[PDB]
């Protein structure tokens, strides 16, 4: 029996981003949710005036829902918006949820892993230079305060969602110093500050092999920037594609929700799967303290995709994104 409307920043993205964003807008008005969108238009992933406006809007509203650009830049974590979010807002933790869905034909069933990845360092803060012709040199940093943050974040997350395992993924066998620092800080913070949670380590190459062969052994994966993308794409393939993967990005003061795989591989009008955007939408709702709304919307989409009717073409259906949205809205009125 509330008394306010949250203003949340909405950054739809390109054409497909607008399609899937609109699906959420549609479901939200239909459920009559006390949310007013402050929608921002950026053109390119680098449109300078749009990035500034989006940043300024997140500074005001703190919460944000963000669609896709299917340029290579948005999908990898670079491009003006992503670096502005990371440098200006200090959004340091990327979370991706890979849960298997009831009616999706997958080679390995019943998957449930979370991948949390550090977002301000390593790959995202280097220097590269070509100082003699034909020689490129990279200089990257790993620091203890940044890795302490991401550790506490991952443990705090495990705690809150009753996960029992947190595994640090690193390459400390070769990078004995930097990735060694990473493995150690994670395991120490585990033993002194979070005893109820099982800490472990795995070398990233072994974790890749292990993830495609026996995914069930994993629960929460915490990794540096450089390995998160690879682990996240194995995760997306495991559960039936990028279209299914919820996501969230957190800083101390800001949160921005968005599909966890950046739709990397996911062509035509009104055919795209809106599920990742909708599920990210419900993570946002939980965060906002709504989440009664979130349980309903979540039930609706799981139910919809469970019955092979009205499903979108990437999970074996033949319906348009609109058809899928309307089916969901339909089960919502009768619930």
Partner 1 sequence: QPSIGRYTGKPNPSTGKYTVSFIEGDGIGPEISKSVKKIFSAANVPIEWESCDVSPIFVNGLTTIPDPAVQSITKNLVALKGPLATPHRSLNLTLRKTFGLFANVRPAKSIEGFKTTYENVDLVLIRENTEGEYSGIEHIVCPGVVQSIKLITRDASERVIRYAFEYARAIGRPRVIVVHKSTIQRLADGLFVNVAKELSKEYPDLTLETELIDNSVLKVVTNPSAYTDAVSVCPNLYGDILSDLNSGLSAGSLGLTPSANIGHKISIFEAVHGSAPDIAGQDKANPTALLLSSVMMLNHMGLTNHADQIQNAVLSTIASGPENRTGDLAGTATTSSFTEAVIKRL
Tell me which residues touch its own copies (CB under 8 A): 1-5, 7, 29-30, 32, 34, 36, 38, 56, 59-60, 62-63, 131-132, 135, 137, 145, 148-149, 152-153, 156, 159-160, 193, 248, 250-255, 287, 289, 332-333, 335
59 binds, among its own copies, partner 1, none (CB under 5 to 8 A by kind): its own copies
Check: CB of residue 46 under 8 Å from CB of residue 14.
no
Q: Report strand pairing: 220-223 vs 112-118.
A: parallel
Check: CB of residue 145 under 8 Å from CB of residue 118.
no
Cβ 206 to partner 1, closest distance in Å? Answer: 7
Rounded to whole angstroms, what are the CA distances from 61 to 5, 248, 260?
12, 16, 22
Task: Confirm or deny that 5 is annotated as ligand binding.
Answer: no
The C-alpha atoms of residue 93 and residue 110 are separated, in whole angstroms, by 26
* Residue choice 30, 63, 101, 175 for contact with partner 1 (CB under 8 A): 175
User: Would you count residue 204 as binding partner 1 (CB under 8 A)?
Assistant: yes
Residues 259-298 that bind partner 1 (CB under 8 A): 261, 264-265
Work out the number of other CB atoms within 10 angstroms of the CB of residue 50.
18
- Which of 145, 268 has the CB closer to partner 1? 145
Burial of 160 (0-12, 13-18, 19+ CB in 10 A): exposed
The C-alpha atoms of residue 201 and residue 170 are separated, in whole angstroms, by 8
User: Would you count residue 174 as binding partner 1 (CB under 8 A)?
Assistant: yes
Cβ 4 to its own copies, closest distance in Å? Answer: 5
Check: CB of residue 256 under 8 Å from CB of residue 263.
no
Task: Confirm or deny that 205 is annotated as ligand binding.
Answer: yes
Tokens of 233: 């794409």
Interface residues with partner 1 (CB under 8 A) are 72-73, 75-76, 78, 107-108, 127-132, 134-145, 171, 174-178, 181, 204-206, 208-214, 227, 229-230, 233-234, 236-238, 241-242, 261, 264-265
Residues annotated as binding site for substrate?
Answer: 86, 117, 205
């Amino acid at each position: 029996k509330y008394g306010g409307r949250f203003t949340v920043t909405l950054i739809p993205g390109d054409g497909v981003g607008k399609e899937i964003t609109d699906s959420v807008r549609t479901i939200f008005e239909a459920e009559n949710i006390p949310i007013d969108w402050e929608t921002i238009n950026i053109k390119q992933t680098d449109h300078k005036e749009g990035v500034y406006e989006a940043v300024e809007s997140l500074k005001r509203n703190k919460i944000g829902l963000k669609g896709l650009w299917h340029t290579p830049a948005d999908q990898t974590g670079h491009g003006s918006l992503n670096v502005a979010l990371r440098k200006q807002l200090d959004i340091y933790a990327n979370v991706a949820l890979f849960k298997s869905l009831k009616g999706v034909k997958t080679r390995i069933p019943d998957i449930d892993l979370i991948v949390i990845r550090e977002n301000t360092e390593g790959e995202f803060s280097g220097l590269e230079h070509e100082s003699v012709p034909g020689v490129v040199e990279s200089l990257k940093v790993m620091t203890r305060p940044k890795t302490e943050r991401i550790a506490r974040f991952a443990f705090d997350f495990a705690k809150k969602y009753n996960r029992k395992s947190v595994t640090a993924v690193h390459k400390a066998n070769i990078m004995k110093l930097g990735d060694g620092l990473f493995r150690n800080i994670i395991t120490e913070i585990g033993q002194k500050e979070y005893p109820d949670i099982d800490v472990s380590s795995i070398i990233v190459d072994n974790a890749s092999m292990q993830a495609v062969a026996k995914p069930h052994q994993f629960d929460v994966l915490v990794t540096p920037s450089m390995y998160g993308t690879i682990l996240g794409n194995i995760g997306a393939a495991l559960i039936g594609g990028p279209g299914l993967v919820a996501g969230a990005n957190f800083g101390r003061d800001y949160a921005v929700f968005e599909p966890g795989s950046r739709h990397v591989g996911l062509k035509g009008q009104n055919v795209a799967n809106p599920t990742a955007m909708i599920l990210s939408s419900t993570l946002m709702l939980n965060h906002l303290g709504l989440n009664e709304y979130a349980t309903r919307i979540s039930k609706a989409v799981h139910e919809t995709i469970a019955e092979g009717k009205h499903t979108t073409r990437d999970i074996g259906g033949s319906s348009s994104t609109t058809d899928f949205t309307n089916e969901i809205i339909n089960k919502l009125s009768t619930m």
